C-alpha cells in the first residue's frame, strides 16, 4: 500500500487568490493520477484524472501537473463556492494482475475567506415538553459570520463546561459564511435551579452575546 | 447513468453486514471497474477494493481489507460488498463508484461516477429513535417581521436522520445543522429555517429510517 502524503491539511485563501495543493507518494506509481472535490454530506466528485486533463465540466481555473512522486493541484480565481475539502489518489501495480491498488490523499480543506462579518446570535429556550424528560438542550444559533467563531455558555455568570456540542455548516456558496449551532444540555434538576442562559460567540475581540431568563419563557 | 448503494445499518461488534450497489442508466461491460470507498464521520477517503464489471478481470482489495471484506457482483446492475468481522474502525459512510474511462479498452484509474453512500454504525447498543422539540425566541422577546424556527432531533441512533419543512415547499434560507455524536453514542441535530411572520405556523418533517420514525412537529413562533 502506498502512501499519499498530501499538503496542507487546510489553507485559506482570499476571493479571487491562487492556491496549490500538493500530494507527494512515498512509493512511486503511475501518471494515472487524479483530484476530487468534495462538499459536506455529497460524494465526491473527480476535477482531474491522468495527471493534468479535466473532468467534464471543471473550469480552467483548476489546474493539475505533477510526474513521478509528487503532483499539484492549482485552484486560482477562488469563489466562495470552491470552497471543500480536495483529495489526491493514485494508482499502482499492474492493472493486469489482482496485485495494485488505489490511494487517496488525507485531504486538504480549502477556506476561502470573504470580508469578514460578525454573526447574528439565537437562544432557543427548551420546549415545555423538554424539561418533563429530566433533561433539557438549549439551542443555539451564530449565524452568517467569518471568520471562525468559538463558543462560551455561562450559566447565571459561571461559564459552563461540560454538556456542551457544536456544529458548522459549510462555508455558504455565495458570501462564504459559516453558520454554527450549539448546544447546552442540563439536568431539570440544574436547569430549574438556576435563572439566566447566556450564549457567548467570539471572535476574536469581538463578541456577540444572546440570553434568557427562564421565568421569562 | 446512476449508482445507489443500500444496506448499511446499525450491527453489534464482531457482526458482520452486506452492501449492495445498484447501477441505473447503464448495465455493466468491459471496459472499467466497480470499486468501494469508505469515509469515516470527519476522516479522509478509505479505498477498500475492486472488480471488474465483466467479472473476467481481476478483484483487487487495499492490504488491510483482503481477508475480512470481499466483493462480488450479484448481477448485471448489482455490486455486492461482503463485510466480516466488523470492528468500529468499519463505522463509516461506505461509497460506491465507477472508474471512468476516456476510451473503450480499460479505466483510467480515476473515479467519476459516485453513488451518494450507505452508512455502516458498527455499535453495542440498540437503535433508539429520536425525540423532537420545537425551537423557538423566547416568548418574552417582542417580536419581528421575519422569525427564526427550528427543530431539535436528539438522542437517535444510527444515522441519519432527515429534516425536511412543511414537507419540502419550503427550502429558502434553510439551515440543517451536522450532527454530533454526544458521549453517550447517541446523535443530536437541530435544524431552523427564516420566514416572514405571517403567523402562519411551520412544520417540521424529521425521519429517521433505523426505527421507522416519522414526527411531524409544528412550531409556533412561542409567544407563550
Known amino acids: 500500500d502506498v502512501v499519499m502524503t498530501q499538503t496542507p491539511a487546510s489553507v485559506e485563501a482570499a476571493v479571487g487568490g491562487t492556491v496549490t495543493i500538493k500530494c507527494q507518494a512515498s512509493?512511486?506509481?503511475?501518471?494515472?493520477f487524479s483530484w476530487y472535490q468534495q462538499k459536506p454530506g455529497q460524494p465526491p466528485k473527480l476535477l482531474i484524472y491522468?495527471?493534468?486533463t479535466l473532468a467534464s465540466g471543471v473550469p480552467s481555473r483548476f489546474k493539475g501537473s505533477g510526474s513521478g512522486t509528487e503532483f499539484t493541484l492549482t485552484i486560482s480565481d477562488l469563489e466562495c463556492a470552491d470552497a471543500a475539502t480536495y483529495y489526491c489518489?493514485?494508482?499502482?501495480?499492474?492493472?493486469?494482475?489482482?496485485?495494485?491498488?488505489?490511494?487517496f490523499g488525507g485531504g486538504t480543506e480549502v477556506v476561502v475567506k470573504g470580508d469578514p462579518v460578525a454573526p447574528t446570535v439565537l437562544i432557543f429556550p427548551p420546549a415545555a415538553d423538554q424539561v418533563a424528560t429530566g433533561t433539557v438542550t438549549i439551542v443555539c444559533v451564530a449565524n452568517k459570520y467569518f471568520p471562525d467563531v468559538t463558543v462560551t455558555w455561562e450559566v447565571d455568570g459561571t461559564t459552563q463546561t461540560t454538556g456542551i456540542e457544536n456544529s458548522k455548516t459549510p462555508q455558504n456558496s455565495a458570501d462564504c459564511t459559516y453558520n454554527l449551532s450549539s448546544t447546552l444540555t442540563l439536568t431539570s434538576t440544574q436547569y430549574n435551579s438556576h435563572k439566566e442562559y447566556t450564549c457567548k460567540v467570539t471572535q476574536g475581540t469581538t463578541s456577540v452575546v444572546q440570553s434568557f431568563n427562564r421565568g421569562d419563557c | 447513468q446512476s449508482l445507489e448503494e443500500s444496506g448499511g445499518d446499525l450491527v453489534k461488534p464482531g457482526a458482520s453486514l452486506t452492501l449492495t450497489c445498484t447501477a441505473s442508466?447503464?448495465?455493466?461491460?468491459?471496459?472499467?471497474?466497480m470499486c468501494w470507498v469508505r469515509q469515516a464521520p470527519g476522516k479522509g477517503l478509505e479505498w477498500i477494493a475492486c472488480?471488474?464489471?465483466?467479472?473476467?478481470?481481476?478483484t483487487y482489495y487495499a492490504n488491510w481489507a483482503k481477508g475480512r471484506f470481499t466483493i462480488s457482483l450479484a448481477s448485471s446492475t448489482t455490486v455486492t460488498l461482503q463485510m466480516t468481522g466488523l470492528t468500529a474502525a468499519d463505522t463509516a459512510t461506505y461509497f460506491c463508484?465507477?472508474?471512468?474511462?476516456?476510451?473503450?479498452?480499460?479505466?483510467?484509474?480515476?473515479?467519476?461516477?459516485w453513488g451518494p453512500g450507505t452508512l455502516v454504525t458498527v455499535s453495542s447498543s440498540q437503535p433508539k429513535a429520536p425525540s423532537v422539540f420545537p425551537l423557538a425566541p423566547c416568548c418574552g422577546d417582542t417580536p419581528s417581521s421575519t422569525v427564526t424556527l427550528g427543530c431539535l432531533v436528539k438522542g437517535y441512533l444510527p444515522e441519519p436522520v432527515t429534516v425536511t419543512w412543511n414537507s419540502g415547499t419550503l427550502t429558502n434560507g434553510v439551515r440543517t445543522f451536522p450532527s454530533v455524536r454526544q458521549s453517550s453514542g447517541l446523535y443530536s441535530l437541530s435544524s431552523v429555517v427564516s420566514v416572514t411572520s405571517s403567523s402562519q405556523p411551520v412544520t417540521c418533517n424529521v425521519a429517521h429510517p433505523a426505527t421507522n420514525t416519522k414526527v411531524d412537529k409544528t412550531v409556533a413562533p412561542s409567544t407563550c
Open positions: 463508484a465507477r472508474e471512468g474511462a476516456d476510451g473503450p479498452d480499460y479505466g483510467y484509474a480515476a473515479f467519476s461516477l
Open positions: 442508466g447503464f448495465s455493466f461491460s468491459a471496459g472499467y471497474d
Open positions: 472488480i471488474y464489471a465483466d467479472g473476467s478481470g481481476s
Open positions: 512509493q512511486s506509481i503511475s501518471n494515472y
Open positions: 491522468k495527471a493534468s
Open positions: 489518489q493514485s494508482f499502482y501495480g499492474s492493472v493486469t494482475s489482482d496485485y495494485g491498488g488505489f490511494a
